[PDB]
C-alpha cells in the first residue's frame, strides 16, 4: 500500500559536538509532506516542491549539540494518509566532556581461546559505557558499571581482532570523547 520510509544519518549516527549532520529520509514519489519527529514531537517538515519528481528529503543540523541528540523517526503524506513510521534513528552526540581510560585484561594482543575482558573507567559520567570496534562490522557493545565498566569478550577468536574504542555517557545519546585505541 503506502511503503515504509527509510531514515539514516550522513556521515554517521555518531556525531561529535558542533559538527554537521544531515538526516536523510527516503519515502515515495508523489508524497506531499515529509516529517522528522524528534523524541515524540514534530521537529521538521519538508514539502517536496515537485512531489512526483522526488522520493527523498534532506534535513540538516548545522552544529550538533546534546539538545538534538536522541531518537528520530520519519513519516510522509500522500493525500491525507500518513506512511507508518520509518526505522528509529539514534542520533548520538560524541566528544561531550571528558576522555575515558581504556585498559584491557589480560593484554593488548593474546593467543586465541583466552578470556579477554575490556575495562573502561571515567568518574563524573553515568553508569553506562560503550565499547566500539572500528571499521569492519562497526557494532556497539553497551556496558554497565559505577565509575569503571567491565566489557567481557570471553574466549577470543580471529573476529575479536581489531582496534577497539571506549565511550562514557552523560545520557544514552550524549557520549563522551573516544578513549585512546587498543
Amino acid at each position, epitope marked *: 500500500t*503506502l511503503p515504509k520510509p527509510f531514515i539514516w544519518a550522513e556521515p554517521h549516527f555518531m556525531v561529535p559536538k558542533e559538527k554537521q549532520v544531515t538526516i536523510c529520509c527516503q519515502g515515495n514519489y508523489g508524497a*506531499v*509532506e515529509y516529517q522528522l*519527529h524528534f523524541e515524540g514531537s*514534530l521537529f521538521a*517538515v519538508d*514539502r517536496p*516542491k*515537485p*512531489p*512526483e519528481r522526488i522520493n527523498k528529503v534532506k534535513f540538516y543540523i548545522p552544529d550538533m549539540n546534546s539538545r538534538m541528540a536522541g531518537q528520530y523517526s520519519c*513519516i510522509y503524506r*500522500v*493525500g*491525507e*494518509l*500518513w506512511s*507508518e*513510521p520509518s526505522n528509529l534513528l539514534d542520533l548520538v552526540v560524541t566528544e561531550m566532556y571528558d576522555t575515558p581510560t581504556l585498559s584491557v585484561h589480560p593484554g593488548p594482543e593474546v593467543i586465541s581461546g583466552e578470556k579477554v575482558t575490556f575495562y573502561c573507567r571515567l568518574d563524573t559520567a553515568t553508569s553506562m559505557f560503550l565499547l566500539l570496534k572500528e571499521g569492519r562490522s562497526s557494532h556497539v557493545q553497551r556496558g554497565y558499571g559505577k565509575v569503571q565498566a567491565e566489557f567481557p569478550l570471553g574466549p577470543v577468536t580471529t573476529a575479536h581482532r581489531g582496534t577497539y574504542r571506549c565511550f562514557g555517557s552523560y545520557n544514552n545519546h550524549a557520549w563522551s570523547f573516544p578513549s585512546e585505541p587498543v
Partner: antibody, heavy 117, light 108 residues
Framework: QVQLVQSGAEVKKPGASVKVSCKAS????????MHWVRQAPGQGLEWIGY????????EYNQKFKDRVTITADKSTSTAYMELSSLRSEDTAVYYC??????????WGQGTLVTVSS | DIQMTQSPSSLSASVGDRVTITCRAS??????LAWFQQKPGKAPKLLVY???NLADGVPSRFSGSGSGTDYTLTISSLQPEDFATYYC?????????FGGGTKVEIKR
C-alpha cells in the same frame, strides 16, 4: 458502507469545554486520518486539526492548538474533539472527516455546538 | 498560511447551463486540491480530489482542472440536483484551507 456518526447537539456556556465524539464504522479506523472541520452560522468551512489513530500523532491549526485536543480511541474505534474556553464565535456545526489518500473521503452528519450565556 | 480565493461568491444559472467556478491559491499547491458540494442542511460531499479526479458516485458532468495556484470546477449542463454551495480546499500545507464558497442558484 463507511459511516461517520457524531455525538449529539451540545449547548455550552462561554468559557466551558465541549468534547464531541465520532464513531467510525464500515472501514479500518487506524488505516486513515481523522480531521475536524467546523462551519460557523452563515459561513464557510474552517479546519481545526487531525489525528492519526495508528500513531496517536496530531497536528492542529495554530488558531486553536492551545484550546483544542483531538484524540483517538482505538479499542472503541472513535475519535474525539475537546474545545476548551469557548468564546461566542465557537458556535458552529463540527464535522469529523476521514482522511484518505483521496483527501476527505467521508464526513459525519455534523454536531451543533451552540455557545452562549 | 495558504489563502484560497473562490470566485464568484454566488451565481445564477438555468437548468442545462455550463457553470465555471474559479479557485486561486496564494502559493503553488502541486495539484493538492479538492472540491466539495454542500446542499442546504447536509454535510459537504467530496466531488473532485487531486485537482482533476472525480469521486466515486460523482456524475460525468462535473470536471476538475488546474496545475498550481489556478484551478476551476465546471459543470457542463446544470441539473436540478446540482444547485448547492461549492468549496475548493488545499492539502499541500498545514493548516488545510477552504475557499469562501460558491452558491449555485436557479435563474428565473
Amino acid at each position: 458502507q463507511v459511516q461517520l456518526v457524531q455525538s449529539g447537539a451540545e449547548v455550552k456556556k462561554p468559557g466551558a469545554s465541549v468534547k464531541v465524539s465520532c464513531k467510525a464504522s464500515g472501514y479500518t479506523f487506524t488505516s486513515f486520518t481523522m480531521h475536524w472541520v467546523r462551519q460557523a452560522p452563515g459561513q464557510g468551512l474552517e479546519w481545526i486539526g487531525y489525528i492519526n489513530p495508528s500513531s496517536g500523532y496530531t497536528e492542529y491549526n495554530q488558531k486553536f492548538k492551545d484550546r483544542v485536543t483531538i484524540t483517538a480511541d482505538k479499542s472503541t474505534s472513535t475519535a474525539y474533539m475537546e474545545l476548551s474556553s469557548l468564546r461566542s464565535e465557537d458556535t458552529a456545526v463540527y464535522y469529523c472527516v476521514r482522511g484518505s489518500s483521496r483527501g476527505f473521503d467521508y464526513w459525519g452528519q455534523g454536531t451543533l455546538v451552540t455557545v452562549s450565556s | 498560511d495558504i489563502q484560497m480565493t473562490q470566485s464568484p461568491s454566488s451565481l445564477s444559472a438555468s437548468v442545462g447551463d455550463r457553470v465555471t467556478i474559479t479557485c486561486r491559491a496564494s502559493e503553488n499547491i502541486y495539484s493538492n486540491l479538492a472540491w466539495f458540494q454542500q446542499k442546504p442542511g447536509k454535510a459537504p460531499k467530496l466531488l473532485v480530489y487531486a485537482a482533476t479526479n472525480l469521486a466515486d458516485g460523482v456524475p460525468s458532468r462535473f470536471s476538475g482542472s488546474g496545475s498550481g495556484t489556478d484551478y476551476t470546477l465546471t459543470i457542463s449542463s446544470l441539473q436540478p440536483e446540482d444547485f448547492a454551495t461549492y468549496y475548493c480546499q488545499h492539502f499541500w500545507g498545514t493548516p488545510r484551507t477552504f475557499g469562501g464558497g460558491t452558491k449555485v442558484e436557479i435563474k428565473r
